[PDB]
């Protein structure tokens, strides 16, 4: 689909049997999601941006269905204000920026 | 042009006769530039990122050329990791997400 930027580009993603809404973020290297339990073991990690850094848990090789498109990748779980889909997963669904 | 997200979507912007590197950020509602001198007065604004809120200086009606596309809009100046081009300026140059 062709998403415009008049409003925030939120899409419905499905992960772990839960349907969540997330932002398609081209400025985000990683994919950060709000606190939830994911199977598998995790690795502690610090990610930052404007406002500073936050501690998250890095779960590898998780499956996320972004608007029907399946994607596999690293997912960081932590105290983020909004679920964000980064470049790692955006590339897998063939997302591009045009202008 | 079409931009894939395998790498960071950095473009060259021209602001105040100076060239700068900037990130095409669809997850950014606003355009936040690094510390520089801009013309006119400024108003205060609180913007929240991943690590929290910060204070920035709001300058209105600033000319900024993004990849040869001129845009006149609101630019915020404050403590940011990199120059960020947000939805406010992306909509002006006609930027969309496709997939
Ligand atoms: C624009 C602001 C105004 C108000 C909101 O609209 C707001 N938007 C945002 O802040 C959104 C989130 C949001 C959305 C809605 C509501 C609230 C928040 C995130 C933003 O789109 C992207 N953001 C760009 C700058 N940036 C970097 O350049 C960067 C890159 N690399 C670094 N590193 C670490 C490793 N090193 C090796 C090399 C340097 C460091 Cl420290 N920093 C951090 C990055 C970010 O946050 N990435 C994630 C993985 C943490 C998500």
UniProtKB/Swiss-Prot annotation, chains A, B:
Region annotation Dimerization of protease: where it falls in the sequence: 1-5, 49-55, 88-99
Residues in coiled coil: none
Entry annotation: catalytic residues: 25
Residue ranges of domain Peptidase A2 in the record: 20-89
Function: Aspartyl protease that mediates proteolytic cleavages of Gag and Gag-Pol polyproteins during or shortly after the release of the virion from the plasma membrane. Cleavages take place as an ordered, step-wise cascade to yield mature proteins. This process is called maturation. Displays maximal activity during the budding process just prior to particle release from the cell. Also cleaves Nef and Vif, probably concomitantly with viral structural proteins on maturation of virus particles. Hydrolyzes host EIF4GI and PABP1 in order to shut off the capped cellular mRNA translation.
Subunit note: Homodimer, whose active site consists of two apposed aspartic acid residues.
Protein name, per record: Protease
Gene: gag-pol
């Amino acid at each position: 689909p062709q998403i415009t930027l008049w409003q925030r580009p939120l899409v419905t993603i499905k992960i772990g049997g839960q349907l969540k809404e997330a932002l398609l973020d081209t400025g985000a290297d990683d994919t950060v999601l709000e606190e939830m339990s994911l199977p598998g073991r995790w690795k502690p990690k610090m990610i930052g941006g404007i406002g500073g850094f936050i501690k998250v848990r890095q779960y590898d090789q998780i499956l996320i269905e972004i608007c029907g498109h399946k994607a596999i990748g690293t997912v960081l779980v932590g105290p983020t204000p909004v679920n964000i889909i980064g470049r790692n997963l955006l590339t897998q669904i063939g997302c591009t920026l045009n202008f």
